[PDB]
Amino acid sequence: MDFGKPNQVTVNYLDENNTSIAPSLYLSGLFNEAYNVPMKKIKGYTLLKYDSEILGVFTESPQTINIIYQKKAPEQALEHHHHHH
């Protein structure tokens, strides 16, 4: 069983509501390669945080990296509407 198994890393550019504001980036490099994480400053956001699991090698299964960019604009023009779903 080695068919249908990509070694690509799924990089997600998350906003805040766990929504990716950019199409999930399929990082495709060499197999067992130690890669770098592609980062882009979207709309002037500050990198909120990413998960510690980034430094390693392209695995035999699609790895998922959550890269979150937080709005560096204060909660004056930004409204968080809290409701019970």
The three state secondary structure string of the chain is CCCCCCCCEEEEEECCCCCEEEEEEEECCCCCCCCCCCCCCHHHEEEEEECCCCCCCCCCCCEEEEEEEEECCCCCCCCCCCCCC
In the block, residue with structure tokens 């890393």: 9
Nearest to 37 by CA among 22, 53, 21: 53
The phi, psi pair for 44, rounded to 5°, reads 65, 50
Residues in contact with 46: Cβ distance below 8 Å, sequence separation at least 6, in sequence order: 69, 70, 71, 72
How far from 69 is each of 23, 42, 73, CA to CA, in Å? 14, 8, 12
Q: Residue 43 and residue 31: Cα distance in Å, rounded?
A: 33
Is residue 16 within 8 A of residue 66, CB to CB? The reply is: no
Domain spanning 1-85: CATH superfamily: Putative peptidoglycan bound protein (lpxtg motif) (3.10.20.320)
